[PDB]
Structure formats: structure tokens, C-alpha cells
């Protein structure tokens, strides 16, 4: 339950599924980059743009919110007309960001900024972001945190910032940064820079360091949903749903959400769809593909009537990431196996979907 500013300066409700998944205050307003925004100026070694399969349809650009000269004007408009809690995110702080910009953003009315920091070691940040000026942002963080509530994002990348994550959190706390969010790196089978996922032992090590720092330091240390999912410890906190369908019913989910979805729907068959299109450690349900779904459909019995539920998050408009149109995927399933396919965004929507088809 949050908002973002549109290109024409209007409000648009959004969900945590369009951000990083963390639960946020309900007066949050995100100021995204406009069309006047340029690129990030980096070449991060883990950059997801650089590890997509070779024949995937290109999606979005390398937008950096700060590379929009109309940002202040959009912040000032939002402050006057909505007076919500204004956050800027999607920035590495390496372009169009200095003391003067911090002042102008503060006077415009910005409340909070969320920066991709990754590490407070300058030489490491230079190599990890392939940007020889990446150390300047680290020097600015104390001044940043004096002006805004500051959230530092860290993409945990083995060989760069995993072993010394405790020192990085201490540095951020001493700079006055208010919050740090820890994201284990996502690696496909097409990564070109010898980036590797955190092992199970590395995930646990970072988790324990983060819990220790969070009970010592004033900085809020956040282990976000993707991290908990990679640890096998993700939960919605919801009571299990006792919906019991009369007809063959399947909930398709990804590898990361499968344990929680299986727990939430004890009388429904939950099907884990492994992501062979992306491979690596990709397992989130918004990255499911038409071909992976069709592989698991192939294993199902034919039915005179049956329901398959898919996560709505895997569709962008009516397209999947691997090039399927929604209606073509659904018609192939109906003709070949007999199932109706429905989609929904959140787990709490599933009982009402099932009830309507029933
Ligand atoms: C972390 C993340 C990544 C990581 C990888 C994570 C991983 N290891 O799998 C990285 C940064 C590598 C990444 C990359 C990409 N990502 Co990404 N990513 C995310 C993000 C921000 C969070 C995922 C998360 O928190 N998962 C935690 C688990 C528990 O969530 P989950 O599996 O989705 O399950 C929940 C819901 O889906 C739902 N649910 C689950 N199963 C089911 C089933 C049913 C039937 C129902 C009703 C509900 C339901 O309930 C669950 C509990 O909340 C999401 C947005 C988001 N907030 O979800 C985008 C998102 C998945 N990514 C997206 C995109 C576009 C990409 C890229 C293609 C970007 C690009 N242009 O290259 C790449 C592809 C891979 C690559 N090249 O690296 C889009 C996908 C949209 C689409 N399908 O067209 C999303 C949805 C962002 C968005 N809002 O647009 N990503
Ligand atoms: N392989 C990967 N694993 C995890 N997070 C990744 C990733 N590749 C990129 N990210 C992070 O996912 C977010 C994409 S949002 C856009 C950020 C913006 N381009 C910027 O200037 O920083 C950023 O925090 C980015 O650092
Ligand atoms: C994978 C997709 O999710 C978006 N996204 C939003 N927040 C994050 C985050 N903290 N880490 C990774 N991707 C994120 C990216 O902008 C990309 O388009
Ligand atoms: S900041 Fe880094 S990860 Fe984000 S788009 Fe630019 S190069 Fe890719
Ligand atoms: K704390």
C-alpha cells in the first residue's frame, strides 16, 4: 500500500512487488526516474542486464533517478500537493550527485534516499561497479545522512563484500546511515564476470553477522524477503488457508516461495517450477517463464475440469520473459491438458479465485 509519482505528476498506487519486497510505511511515495533521466554511469559486475539469456527480449534501460534534472521539480510538486513521505531510490549516487545536489534535494522536500552502496571500501567499490570515481559517494554519505533518512542497499557479492560485511555495517553506522538492506547476489547461468552465488554457509554467516550488528548498532539492519527465501526461512506470517477445492487444483510457484506456499495452502497441490531459463540461483516467482511452466504442465494428468494458478508477477503486460503471450500459453494448456489457468498477485487472493471457479 504505497504510491509512486507518474510522468504527469499524478499518484499511482503500487505494491511491494514493484519494489524490493520490504514492508513499508503506508504514506510512502516513491519518485521514480522520469523519461528525462539518463543512465547510471556504472558497469556493475553483477548487473542483471549483462547476464540475461542471449535471446531474451530487451526490457528497461539503465535508469538512475538522480540523472533526471527535473527531479527537484517533481519532489517540490509532490511535497506541495500530496505531502506524503517522499523517497528517491534506484540510484548509485555516482552521477549528478554532490554536496550541491544534496542541498537542492533537501530544500525541494526529499525525506529519504535509498542508495546502492555495496561497500564502504573505496577500491572495492571501484572494481565492483567498474567506475573509477565510485569512492566519491562513500565520502558523501555522512553529509547525505545529515539531510535525509538514508537507506544503504548492499548487493552481497563473494570476493568483494561478504567476508567483511560486519566492518561495512559498522562504517555505515558511524557515518549516521539509518538503515542497511542486505541483498545476496542473483546469478544466472549466463554471468560473464565469474560472479558466483553465496553458498549456504556464506548466507548463514552474513545472516548471523547482520543479527549481531542489529542488536548492537543504532542502524536498522534489514534481512529482506529474497535473503530469507535464499536461507529457506521466508514466511508471510499468515495463518494457513483451509480452502479445499473440489476439482483438480494446482498452485505453480518458484523454488524460493515453494516452502511457504506449500505451508499456506495445505489442501492444494503446490508445484515447484525450477527456473531452467535463467538457471543459476534464480528462483523467484516473478521470473518464472512460459517454457518452465509448460514443462511442469506436461507432467500433470489430463482433466475434464481443473484449475492451475500462476503468479501474476511473471507477466509483463501479457508477455512472459521468454517470449510467450499470455493467451497462447493459456490456450495451449487448455487444449492439451484441459486446465483453466488463472493468475493472482498475492497469496491472500487465491482462496477467492478458487471460490469463483468452484
Ligand atoms: C530480487 C530480485 C531479482 C534478483 C534475483 C532473485 C532470485 N535469486 O531469484 C535479480 C536482481 C538478479 C533480479 C534480476 C531480474 N529481474 Co528481478 N526481481 C527481484 C525482486 C526485486 C524481489 C524478489 C523477491 O523478493 N523474492 C522473494 C520471493 C519469496 O517472492 P516470490 O517468489 O515472488 O513469491 C511471492 C509472490 O510472487 C506470491 N506468489 C508466489 N508464488 C505464487 C503463486 C500464485 C498462484 C500466486 C497467486 C501468488 C504467488 O507470493 C509470494 C510471497 O510474497 C522482484 C520484485 C518483487 N518485489 O517481488 C523482481 C522481479 C521478479 N524481477 C523482474 C525483472 C524484470 C528482472 C530482470 C529480467 C531484469 C532485467 N531486465 O534483466 C532480471 C532477470 C534475471 C537476471 N538477468 O539477473 C520483474 C519481473 C517482471 C516480468 N516477469 O516481466 C520483477 C517482478 C520486478 C517488477 N516488479 O517488475 N531480480
Ligand atoms: N545480480 C544482481 N543481484 C542482486 N541485485 C542486483 C543485481 N544486479 C543489480 N542489482 C541491484 O538491483 C537494483 C536494481 S534497481 C535500479 C538501480 C539503478 N540503476 C542504480 O543506479 O543503482 C539495484 O539496487 C542494483 O544494484
Ligand atoms: C529484477 C528487477 O527488480 C528491480 N528491483 C527493485 N529493487 C531491487 C533490488 N533491491 N534488487 C534487485 N532488483 C530490484 C530491478 O529494477 C529489476 O528491474
Ligand atoms: S547501477 Fe549497476 S546494477 Fe544497476 S543498472 Fe547500472 S550497472 Fe546495472
Ligand atoms: K539496530
Author numbering: 0 to 357
Cite, word for word, the article reporting this structure:
Cobalamin (Cbl)-dependent radical S-adenosylmethionine (SAM) enzymes constitute a large subclass of radical SAM (RS) enzymes that use Cbl to catalyze various types of reactions, the most common of which are methylations. Bioinformatic analysis of Mmp10 identified DUF512 (Domain of Unknown Function 512) as a potential Cbl-binding domain in RS enzymes. X-ray crystal structures of DUF512-containing proteins from Clostridium sporogenes and Pyrococcus furiosus show unique architectural features and confirm the presence of a C-terminal Cbl-binding domain like that of Mmp10. We have uncovered the “Unknown Function” of the DUF512 protein domain, which is to bind the biological cofactor Cbl.
pfDUF512 belongs to a subset of DUF512-containing proteins that do not contain PDZ domains. pfDUF512 was crystallized under anoxic conditions in the presence of SAH, and its structure was determined to a resolution of 2.07 Å. The enzyme contains an N-terminal RS domain (residues 1–222) and a C-terminal Cbl-binding domain (residues 223–357) (topology diagram in Figure S5B). The RS domain has an antiparallel β-sheet (residues 1–14) followed by a loop (L1, residues 15–24) that connects to the TIM barrel core. Although pfDUF512’s substrate is unknown, in the current structure, L1 seems to close the active site of pfDUF512 by forming stabilizing interactions with the acetamide and DMB tail moieties of Cbl. The RS domain of pfDUF512 has a unique (βα)5 TIM barrel core, with the FeS cluster ligated by Cys39, Cys43, and Cys46. A molecule of 5′-dA is observed above the cobalt ion of cobalamin. The ligand (SAH) in the active site binds in an unusual position, neither ligated to the unique iron of the cluster, as seen in Mmp10, nor close to Cbl, as observed in csDUF512. SAH’s ribosyl and methionyl moieties have poor electron density, with very few hydrogen-bonding interactions. By contrast, there is significant electron density for the adenine portion of SAH, which binds approximately in the same position, maintaining a similar hydrogen-bonding network, as observed for Mmp10 and csDUF512. We hypothesize that the presence of 5′-dA above Cbl interferes with the SAH/SAM binding pocket and disrupts the binding of SAH.
